[PDB]
Design a protein around this motif. Structure first.
Motif, short mmCIF file in Angstrom:
data_model
loop_
_atom_site.label_atom_id
_atom_site.label_comp_id
_atom_site.label_asym_id
_atom_site.label_seq_id
_atom_site.Cartn_x
_atom_site.Cartn_y
_atom_site.Cartn_z
N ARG A 1 7.95 12.93 -4.46
CA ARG A 1 8.78 11.73 -4.39
C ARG A 1 7.89 10.51 -4.15
O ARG A 1 8.01 9.49 -4.84
CB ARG A 1 9.84 11.86 -3.27
N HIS A 2 6.97 10.64 -3.20
CA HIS A 2 6.06 9.55 -2.86
C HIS A 2 5.18 9.14 -4.05
O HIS A 2 4.96 7.95 -4.27
CB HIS A 2 5.18 9.97 -1.68
N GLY A 3 4.69 10.11 -4.80
CA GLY A 3 3.86 9.82 -5.96
C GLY A 3 4.60 9.28 -7.18
O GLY A 3 3.99 8.60 -8.01
N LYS A 4 5.90 9.56 -7.30
CA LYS A 4 6.63 9.19 -8.52
C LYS A 4 7.68 8.08 -8.36
O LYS A 4 8.22 7.63 -9.38
CB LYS A 4 7.34 10.45 -9.06
N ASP A 5 8.00 7.66 -7.11
CA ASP A 5 9.10 6.72 -6.87
C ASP A 5 8.81 5.26 -7.23
O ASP A 5 9.73 4.45 -7.24
CB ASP A 5 9.58 6.80 -5.41
N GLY A 6 7.54 4.90 -7.45
CA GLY A 6 7.18 3.52 -7.77
C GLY A 6 7.32 2.57 -6.58
O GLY A 6 7.22 1.35 -6.76
N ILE A 7 7.61 3.11 -5.38
CA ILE A 7 7.70 2.33 -4.15
C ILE A 7 6.28 2.30 -3.59
O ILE A 7 5.64 3.35 -3.51
CB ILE A 7 8.74 2.91 -3.14
N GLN A 8 5.78 1.12 -3.24
CA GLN A 8 4.44 1.02 -2.69
C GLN A 8 4.56 0.77 -1.19
O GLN A 8 4.52 -0.38 -0.75
CB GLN A 8 3.65 -0.10 -3.41
N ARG A 9 4.80 1.85 -0.42
CA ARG A 9 4.94 1.83 1.05
C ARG A 9 4.27 3.05 1.65
O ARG A 9 4.38 4.14 1.09
CB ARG A 9 6.42 1.78 1.50
N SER B 1 0.83 -1.19 0.00
CA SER B 1 0.00 0.00 0.00
C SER B 1 0.86 1.24 0.00
O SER B 1 1.87 1.28 0.70
CB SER B 1 -0.88 0.01 1.23
N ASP B 2 0.45 2.27 -0.75
CA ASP B 2 1.20 3.53 -0.84
C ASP B 2 0.38 4.65 -0.18
O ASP B 2 0.60 5.83 -0.47
CB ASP B 2 1.49 3.85 -2.33
N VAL B 3 -0.56 4.30 0.72
CA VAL B 3 -1.42 5.30 1.33
C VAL B 3 -0.62 6.34 2.13
O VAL B 3 0.37 6.00 2.77
CB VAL B 3 -2.52 4.64 2.22
MG LIG Z 1 5.08 5.59 -3.76
#
Ligand SMILES: [Mg+2]
Ligand SMILES: CCOP(=O)(O)[C@@](O)(CCC(=O)O)[C@H]1SC(CCOP(=O)(O)OP(=O)(O)O)=C(C)N1Cc1cnc(C)nc1N
Ligand SMILES: CCOP(=O)(O)[C@@](O)(CCC(=O)O)[C@H]1SC(CCOP(=O)(O)OP(=O)(O)O)=C(C)N1Cc1cnc(C)nc1N
Ligand SMILES: [Mg+2]
Ligand SMILES: [Mg+2]
Ligand SMILES: [Mg+2]
Lengths: 855, 846
Positions: free
Chosen positions: A682-690, A631-633
Motif C-alpha cells: 500500500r505504501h509503495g503504490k498509493d502515490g501518497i508521499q508521507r 517524504s515517503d521514507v
Molecule cells: Mg507512499
C-alpha cells in the motif's frame, strides 16, 4: 666540499616547509586580529644563486616568490595529508604557477555580484530594520564564490547543483544565486502571503528553498540549481542533502549504481564556523562520503567563516586549529581563502570543482571573513567582542575595496560605478513599491495538511500465486557453481516451500512485498545496521558464497521479466555505517529526491532511533506542514518486550504517536506477515508521499502461530483492525463475548493462547494494526459486531506511560464516546526505563498482564 | 645520495605506518650506500650514522608491530618527543614483568572459556581474539600510578566488559556469576536495573612492582555506543575540580585520567565521538588529555570496515585535535604494554589526547549465539587457523627458559580452579521468588520544611557585587544600566527573572556551594539578559560579579565558586558532559542552558538513556539542571518549544522534577530548593524569553526573604488583595507566561466569575496543594486547562489523562483550551501566531 650542496639541502627543506605548513602563515584573515634552525649556510646573499629542484635549475628569489604566492598570500592550501601522490601533484601543478589575470568582463561580472550582495542587504536594513535577516555583510564574496562553483559545474556539463545551507546570507543566496523572485522575498517581510504561500503551518523565511536554472555568461551551457529547505538545527540538513543528491544520481544512472561515473549532480554544502566544528552530524555525514551505499562522488563544502558564533569566540567553539580540520579524515584538500579577495575566492571555487571532478571526492573551502553587524540585526556585538568590532568599524567592505581596484586599474570610472549601484537599488525600490501596492489578505489560523494527500479510490495490494512462486523460486535460482552456507541453504529451501504451500513467515512476507514491487518496476532501497543478513539472522537479502565470498541477491532476479526484458525495477540493499542521525537523514533525503522509490531504513533495535531524534522531529514528522516538502521514507523499528533489557525492548511508540498530527505519518504495528506485506505494498503504490513508521518483531519472526496463508496474500488487503480468525472464518460466537480486549502487536498471540487454554468464549481480542491515523470507522464497525460487551480493556506490554495507552486512553473515549467510555488500561506500571534489566523479572511482569486480562 | 637519506627518513616517519605489520590476520639512492655515513639530527645532537643503521632503526620503529602516526601534530617538540622514544631501543621487560603479562593473558582467556562452558546460552561479548586489552589496560593504570596520579576513570562498550570488570577493576567473580545465575540479593535487584555488560565498579589498584596505588572506577552506560564518551569527560572534570587539579585548579596535574575504550565500527560512525574530541582543549571542558583504546577487531557485528567508514583508519577522526595515533598488533602483548606506557607518558608530558588502535580479531560470533561464517566466511576460515595470543606468549616464555610447561599449566589450572570454587559457592545459594521491579520514587525524599529564603543583606550584597568593579574597569555603556538596575532591584524590589536567577546562584556560592553554569552564549545570555561575565570595553578583560560572593566580608573564602562558560555549539556532548559533571560532584549546583529549548532534542540519547532513567537502571544519581527557553511568541517552530509533553511522557517514579515557573521569586526558590534539598535528581526548567522583560513578571523583596517555592499559585487578589473566591464559577488552570495574558483579560473585562490557578511544578504533580487550592473555590461549575501549546503538545496530553484519574472529585469534566493539534510546535508566521493566541484568550473568556 662546495657549500652550494649544503645551501641546496636547505632549499629542498624550504619547499617542503611551504607546501606542508605555509598555510599557517598565509594572509587569510581580513581582520588581521592575531637560533637552532639549521639554515645549512643559506642566507639573503644566495637569492640570485641557481639551485637544483626536482630536473630544473631556478634562482632562490624565484623559488621563494612561487612558494610565497602559492601558499602564503590570500590562499592557505592544506593538502599534504592526502594519501594519493597523484592528488598532491595535481594540486601542486595548479597552485605553484602564475595565474592568468581575469578579463575586464570577468572583473566587472564579479563586481556586479558584490554590488547585488551588499545592496540587497542595505536595502533590507532600510526597509525592515526590526526584522531578522542574518545578513551576509562582511562576507559578500560568498556570492561571486558560489557563482563560480555553479558556473564551473555547468562548464563540466554537469546536470544539477543541489545546495544546503544555514541562515548566513540565506536570503541573499536565494535571490542572487538561485533566482527566488525579489517580490516573493519582500512579500515574506510584508507578511502578505497568498493562499499558496500561507499553506500549512509554514516556516521562517531563512529556512526556505527554491529551484531555477543558472545560465552561463562566458559559455554556452546552463545547469539546474536547487536549494533545499531546512530547520533551525544547524548541520542537520547535511545528510539530507547527500541522500537527495544520491537519489537524483541513481535516477540519472550517474554515480555509484550508474552505467557511467559522472556523479552528475553536485552537493554544494554551506556551513557556519562554530556549527561545523561542534555538531557531530558533520563527522557522521563526512564518514558516509566514500561508502558504496551513500557516496555522491564528492561534496563541495563552503564554510562562511566569520570567526564568531553569535557571542562565542572560536577558542570556546573548537579544539582544532581550523574549523575545517574534521574533513581531513576523508582526505579532502582544504583551501583557506581571504574573503576580502573576490578574485582569489572565485579562483579557489573553480579549482575546488575541478578537483571534485578529477577525483570524485570532497573538497573544502574555508572562506575567512567577518560579520559586519551583530549576530542578528537587533543584537549589539560590542558588548562581548569590543576589540573585534573596533577593527570591523575601520574596514571598507569587499565591494568598496574591489570597486576602488577596478577604478585604479582603469576598467571603470567612479561615475559608472555609482550609476550601476543606483540602477540596481532603483530596481529593488520598484519591486518593493509593487509588492507594497498589493491587496492585503486576512490573517487566519494555520490549517492541518491532512486532506492534501489522499489514497486513490481503487488500489489492490493482493498479488497472484505466480508472483509468490516466482519470488520463492528466485531463492534457489543460484549462479552456476555458487556454494551456499550450510545454515543459509534451509532458509532458501523453506522460502520455495512457503511460496507454494503457505505458512509464510514475517521475513519472507517482507521480501514478497519488496520483490513484487521490483517486478512491477519499482526501485527499492533498503538499508540499516546489518540489514543485508538481518540482525535476527532472518532476512538473507544478500547471501555470501562460502568458498569465494561472492554475493548473490535473490530479489535482483525480479528486475528482469521471464522473457528477459527489464521491469525498470531494482533492489539496492546495504549494510549502513554505525550511525542513526546521518543514516536516517540520508534515507529521508533519498525519498524526497526520488518520490517514486520505495525507501526503507531499519534500526538495529527501535531503541536506537532516538539517536536520530533531530531528523524525526524536524524533517520526518513535520516537513510537509512546515515547507510542503514530502517524504515517503519507511522506518522499521524492531520492538517488543522479550526480557532483553531497556535498550532491546522499545521503539518508543508513545513518542511517535505524540508527534503525530494532520495525518503527517502512518504508524503501524502489524501482527501478521500478510498484513505487513499489504502495508508495504500500500505504501509503495498509493502515490501518497508521507512517512511510514513500522514497529517490527524479533521473537515473533519465529513464532509458529504468526504465519500467513497463501489466500491472505492473493485474496486480501491491508486490514487496519483485525478480529480473531474464529469469528471471521471459524465457528466462534460473537454474542457470547462480554469482555473485549483491545491490543496491538505480539501480545495478541499470548492473549489468544490463554483464551484457548481456558476456553474463554466470554473474551474477544481485537487488534489495532494501524495506530495512526486511527482507523475510527473500521474500529466502530468491528465493536458493533459484539452487542453483549459490558467491559473494554486496552492491553499492552509497555509501561503505563509508554506504548499506545498515553494517546489511546485520551483519544478513544473522545473520538468514539459511545464505544470507549469506561475504557480501562492493563499494562506494566509506569517506568522511567522502557523495561526491567532482568529476563526473569520481565517474565513475572508479563504473566501479571495475562492474569489481569483474564481475571 | 645524501638528499635520498633525509627524504627516506621523512617517508618512514610520515608513511611507515601504512606498511607496518599491525594486522594479526594479515587479510590484506643505491644499494652500495649501506656502509656510507650520513649526517642525521640525533636525540643528543647531530650524529653521523651508516645508512644500514638508519634503515634498521626506521624499520623497527615504524614498520614492525607498531604503526606510529604523529607528523600531523603542529608542535615540533611533540614530534621530537615521540621520535626520541620510538627511534631508540625499547626497554626489555624483566622475566618477572613477562610472567605478570602472561598472568593477565591467562586471566583474560580463562575467564571467557569458563563462561563459555557454564553459560553457553547467555551473551557475554567475549574479548577472545583481543585478550591483550587486559595487559594493555593494566599497563595504562600501572603507568598512571607510576606518575603518582589520583584516579583512572574508565568508560567502555560491551567488548570484554565483564572481563575488564573482573580482571582490571576488581568486581567480584561471585557478583558476576550471580548475574548469570539470575539469583540477586535485594540491593542487586533494586530499581528496574540493566544488563550485566552495562554495569560499573570501583576499587584500588596496587602496583605489582612499584610503591604506589591509584583509584580505578568504571562508569555505567546504556547500549547506545559512544554516548557515555562526554559523560566520562564531565565525571573526570568534576573530580579534577574537587581535587584542585586541572583547568580551574592550583596545579596543572589533571590528576584524574579518563581512559576511554571504543569499538572500531562505533568510533567511526557515531557523531558524539567528534563532538567529545572537540571539547578536549576547551577551557570549560578540558580534562588534560584522554587515553583512548580502540578494540579494533576489524568487524562490526556482520559489517565489514569498508561499509562502516570512509577513512583509512577507524581513529582518523582524532587527528583533528592533534592526538598521536599508535596502531599496534594485538597478537604482541609486549608491544601492546609498551604503547600503553608510552601513551600515558605522552598524556602526562603534554596534557592532551592519545589514541591506541589495537588491531585484533573477534574469535567467536558478534555475540556467543551468532554464526559469523554466514557473512564473513574468509575471515573465520583465517581466524580458525590462529593460535591465540595467550598460547603464543606462553610458548615464547617456555622457549626463553623463563617458565616450564608444568608451571604454565599449574598457573592456568589454579585460576580455573578458583573460578570453579566461586561458581560452586554461588550455585549452592538458595533461589528466591522473582518479583516485578519496583519504582525508585520513595528512595529519595525532600527534608521536612526546607527553608530557601535569604535575608535582605544577602540580596543587597549580590546587587552591590554588580558595581564592585576592578580598578580602571570600563563597562560597556549598554551593560552599565543593567548593573545599576540590579543594585536598585536588590534594595527596592521589582526583581526581574534574570536577576532572580543570579540571586539564587550568588546566595548558594555565598553559602559555600560550587555553581557550574554553561550553554550556548550563556555568559551574556541569548536574550542579552544574564551578563554573568562583563567585558572591559577598552581592554577585553573579564569581570564576573558573582565570583565576589566566594569571599566572606571578613576576607575568608566561603568554599564556593562560580564556573560559568560559553559552550561549544553542541547539544549531545554538552548535555552529556553536564550530566557526568553532576554525577562526579553531587555537591555541585550544575546547570546547562539550551539556546532555545527547541534544540535539546539534539541531546535526546542523553535525556532518554542517562537523565530520565539512570537512577532506576543503575542506581546512578544526577542533580543536573536543564534550562530550556520556551514560549509561543511568533518566532517559528524552532524558537517556541522545549517539548514539555516529551519530558512529562518520560517522567515516572519521581526520577525528575519538571517545572515552568511564572515569577522570578518562584524560580529563585526552585533553584535554591534544588541546590539545598540533599536529593540527587535532575530538574527540567521551562524558562522564559519575552517574559524576562514583562513588567508584570517581577517580584517583591518579601517574596525572597519571607517565602518558599510554591508548586501551585493563586492570583494575588485572592491571597493578599480584596478578591472574593466565592464569586468564581469558571476555573482556568494553566502554567507559564500565558497566565499574564489571561490575568490582563480578566482585569480588562472585570471578570470576578473567572479565577486563574498556576501549576508551577508540572512533575511530581502537587496533588495535595492542587486539591487544597481548588477547595477554596466552592462555586466553580466548569474547569479548563488552558495552554498556548498545540493539543498534542504541552501539558494537556498527560494532565488531560492524569488529573481526572488522580483527583476525580476535582477534575471530572476537565476540558482543554489550546491550539489545534500540530505536526510542528507552532506556525512559521508571527501574524498567524498572534491570531491563534487571541483565539485561546477569547475561548477562555467566552
Ligand atoms: Mg507512499
Ligand atoms: C538567538 C540565537 O539562536 P539563533 O540565532 O536563533 C539560531 O537558531 C539561528 C539559525 C536558525 O534559527 O535558523 C542559531 S545561530 C547560532 C550560532 C551559529 O554560529 P556559526 O555556525 O558560526 O554561524 P554564523 O556565525 O554565520 O551565525 C546558534 C548556536 N543558534 C542556535 C542553535 C543551536 N543549536 C543548533 C543545533 N542549531 C541552532 N540553530
Ligand atoms: C544484535 C545487535 O545489536 P547488539 O549486539 O545488541 C548492540 O546493541 C550491543 C551493545 C549493547 O547492547 O550494549 C550493538 S553492537 C553493534 C556493533 C558494534 O561494532 P563495534 O563498534 O566494531 O564493536 P564490536 O566489534 O566490539 O562489537 C551495534 C551496531 N549494536 C547496536 C547499536 C546501534 N546503535 C547504537 C548507537 N548503539 C548500539 N548498541
Ligand atoms: Mg560564524
Ligand atoms: Mg568491532
Ligand atoms: Mg538536589
Amino acid at each position: 666540499g662546495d657549500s652550494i650542496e649544503d645551501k641546496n639541502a636547505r632549499v629542498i627543506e624550504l619547499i617542503a616547509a611551504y607546501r606542508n605548513r605555509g598555510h599557517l602563515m598565509a594572509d587569510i584573515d581580513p581582520l588581521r586580529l592575531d637560533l637552532d634552525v639549521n639554515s645549512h649556510g643559506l642566507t639573503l646573499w644566495d637569492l640570485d644563486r641557481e639551485f637544483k629542484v626536482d630536473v630544473q635549475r631556478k634562482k632562490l628569489r624565484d623559488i621563494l616568490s612561487v612558494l610565497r604566492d602559492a601558499y602564503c598570500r590570500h590562499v592557505g592550501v592544506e593538502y599534504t595529508h592526502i594519501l594519493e601522490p597523484e592528488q598532491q601533484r595535481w594540486i601542486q601543478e595548479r597552485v605553484e604557477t602564475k595565474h592568468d589575470k581575469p578579463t575586464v568582463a570577468e572583473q566587472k561580472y564579479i563586481l556586479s555580484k558584490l554590488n547585488a550582495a551588499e545592496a540587497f542587504e542595505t536595502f533590507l536594513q532600510t526597509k525592515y530594520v526590526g526584522q531578522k535577516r542574518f545578513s551576509l555583510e562582511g562576507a559578500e564574496t560568498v556570492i561571486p564564490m558560489m557563482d563560480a562553483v555553479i558556473d564551473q559545474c555547468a562548464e563540466h556539463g554537469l546536470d544539477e547543483v543541489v545546495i544546503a545551507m544555514p541562515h548566513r546570507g540565506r536570503l541573499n543566496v536565494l535571490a542572487n544565486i538561485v533566482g527566488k523572485p525579489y517580490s516573493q522575498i519582500f512579500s515574506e517581510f510584508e507578511g502578505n502571503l497568498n493562499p499558496s504561500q500561507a499553506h500549512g503551518s509554514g516556516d521562517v523565511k531563512y529556512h526556505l528553498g527554491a529551484t531555477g536554472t543558472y545560465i552561463q555568461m562566458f559559455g554556452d551551457n546552463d545547469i539546474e540549481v536547487s536549494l533545499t529547505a531546512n530547520p533551525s538545527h544547524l548541520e542537520a540538513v547535511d545528510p539530507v542533502l547527500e541522500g537527495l543528491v544520491r537519489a537524483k544520481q541513481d535516477l540519472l544512472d550517474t554515480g555509484e549504481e550508474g552505467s557511467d561515473n559522472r556523479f552528475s549532480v553536485v552537493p554544494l554544502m554551506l556551513h557556519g564556523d562554530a556549527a561545523f566544528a561542534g555538531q557531530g552530524v558533520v563527522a557522521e555525514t563526512l564518514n558516509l562520503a566514500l561508502l558504496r551505499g551513500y557516496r555522491t562522488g564528492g561534496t563541495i563544502h563552503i564554510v562562511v567563516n566569520n570567526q564568531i558564533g553569535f557571542t562565542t569566540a572560536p577558542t570556546d567553539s573548537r579544539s582544532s586549529e581550523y574549523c575545517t580540520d574534521v574533513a581531513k579524515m576523508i582526505g579532502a584538500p582544504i583551501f583557506h581563502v581571504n574573503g576580502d579577495d573576490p578574485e582569489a575566492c572565485a579562483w579557489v571555487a573553480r579549482l575546488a570543482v575541478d578537483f571534485r571532478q578529477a577525483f570524485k571526492k570532497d573538497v573544502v573551502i574555508d572562506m575567512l571573513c567577518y560579520r559586519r553587524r551583530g549576530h542578528n540585526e537587533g543584537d549589539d556585538p560590542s558588548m562581548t567582542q569590543p576589540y573585534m568590532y573596533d577593527v570591523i568599524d575601520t574596514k571598507r567592505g569587499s565591494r568598496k575595496a574591489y570597486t576602488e581596484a577596478l577604478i585604479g586599474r582603469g576598467d571603470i570610472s567612479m561615475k559608472e560605478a555609482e550609476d550601476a549601484l543606483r540602477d540596481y537599488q532603483g530596481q529593488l525600490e520598484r519591486v518593493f513599491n509593487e509588492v507594497r501596492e498589493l491587496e492585503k489578505h486576512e490573517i487566519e489560523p494555520s490549517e492541518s495538511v491532512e486532506a492534501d494527500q489522499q489514497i486513490p479510490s481503487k488500489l489492490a495490494t493482493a498479488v497472484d500465486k505466480a508472483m509468490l512462486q516466482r519470488i520463492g523460486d528466485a531463492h534457489l535460482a543460484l549462479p552456476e557453481g555458487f556454494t551456499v552456507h550450510p545454515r543459509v541453504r534451509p532458509v532458501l529451501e523453506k522460502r520455495r516451500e512457503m511460496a507454494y504451500e503457505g505458512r509464510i513467515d514475517w521475513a519472507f512476507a517482507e521480501l514478497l512485498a519488496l520483490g513484487s514491487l521490483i517486478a512491477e518496476g519499482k526501485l527499492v532501497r533498503l538499508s540499516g545496521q546489518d540489514t543485508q543478513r538481518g540482525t535476527f539472522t532472518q532476512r538473507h537479502a544478500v547471501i555470501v558464497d562460502r568458498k569465494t565470498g561472492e554475493e548473490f541477491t535473490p530479489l535482483q532476479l525480479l528486475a528482469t521479466n521471464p522473457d528477459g526484458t527489464p521491469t525498470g525495477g531494482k533492489f539496492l540493499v546495504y549494510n549502513s555505517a554505525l550511525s542513526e542521525f546521518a543514516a536516517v537523514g540520508f534515507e529521508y533525503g533519498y525519498s524526497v529526491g526520488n518520490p517514486d522509490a520505495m525507501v526503507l531504513w531499519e534500526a538495529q533495535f527501535g531503541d536506537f532511533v532516538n539517536g536520530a531524534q533531530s531528523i524525526i522531529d524536524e524533517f520526518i514528522s513535520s516537513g510537509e506542514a512546515k515547507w510542503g516538502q514530502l517524504s515517503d521514507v519507511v522506518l522499521l523499528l524492531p520492538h517488543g518486550h522479550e526480557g532483553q533489557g531497556p535498550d532491546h525492548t522499545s521503539g518508543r511508540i508513545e513518542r511517535f504517536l505524540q508527534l503525530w498530527a494532520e495525518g503527517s505519518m502512518t504508524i503501524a504495528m502489524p501482527s501478521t506477515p500478510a498484513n505487513y506485506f499489504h502495508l508495504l505494498r500500500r505504501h509503495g503504490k498509493d502515490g501518497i508521499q508521507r512517512p511510514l513508521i513500522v514497529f517490527t518483531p524479533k521473537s515473533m519472526l519465529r513464532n509458529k502461530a504468526a504465519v500467513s496463508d497463501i489466500r491472505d496474500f492473493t485474496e486480501s488487503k491491508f486490514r487496519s483492525v483485525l478480529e480473531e480468525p474464529m469469528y471471521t472464518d471459524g465457528e466462534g460466537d460473537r454474542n457470547k463475548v462480554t469482555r473485549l480486549l483491545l491490543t496491538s502487536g505480539k501480545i495478541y498471540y499470548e492473549l489468544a493462547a490463554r483464551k484457548a487454554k481456558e476456553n474463554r468464549e466470554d473474551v474477544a481480542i481485537v487488534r489495532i494494526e494501524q495506530l495512526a491515523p486511527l482507523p475510527r470507522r473500521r474500529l466502530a464497525e468491528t465493536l458493533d459486531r459484539y452487542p453483549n460487551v459490558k467491559e473494554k480493556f486496552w492491553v499492552q506490554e509497555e509501561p503505563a506511560n509508554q506504548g499506545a495507552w498515553p494517546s489511546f486512553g485520551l483519544t478513544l473515549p473522545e473520538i468514539l464516546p459511545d464505544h470507549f467510555t469506561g475504557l480501562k488500561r492493563i499494562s506494566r506500571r509506569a517506568m522511567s526505563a522502557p523495561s526491567s534489566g532482568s529476563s526473569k523479572v520481565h517474565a513475572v511482569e508479563q504473566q501479571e498482564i495475562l492474569d489481569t486480562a483474564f481475571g
